[PDB]
Design a binder for this molecule. Sequence first.
Ligand SMILES: COc1ccc2c(c1)N(CCC/C=C/c1cccc3c1N[C@H](C)CC(=O)N3)CCO2
Length: 119
Amino acid sequence: SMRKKIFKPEELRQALMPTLEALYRQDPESLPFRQPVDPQLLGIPDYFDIVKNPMDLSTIKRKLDTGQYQEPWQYVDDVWLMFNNAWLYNRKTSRVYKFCSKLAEVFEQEIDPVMQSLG
Ligand SMILES: COc1ccc2c(c1)N(CCC/C=C/c1cccc3c1N[C@H](C)CC(=O)N3)CCO2
């Protein structure tokens, strides 16, 4: 055992950053996820009425760079928050929804062997 394993920030960064890079490499699918949503600039002013906890790729990257994840599952939770936000907000025919579904397929594939490596 019950002694909690400690993960050091550079260990998490080396292990998890490639999985984030794999999401960035999806193009066009990552393009709507690369920056924080600005609802007025994007023409979606209802966004924060629906999505209470925004998350995007640039924020996840900054959190890894600044040691804000103590456990790999906290990083997984933010990636999944980003996915769940987009499945909640967008209509099922929209680009962002279908792009989200593809990013979730890619992330599932990438994160699995990394979680095995971290344990
Ligand atoms: C919109 O779809 C595409 C598809 C391809 C693209 C672009 C846009 N743009 C603009 C990228 C920035 C746009 C974000 C965005 C806009 C409207 C609704 C949502 C957006 N995303 C976040 C996750 C919030 C959300 O849930 N929905 C770049 C070229 O490639």
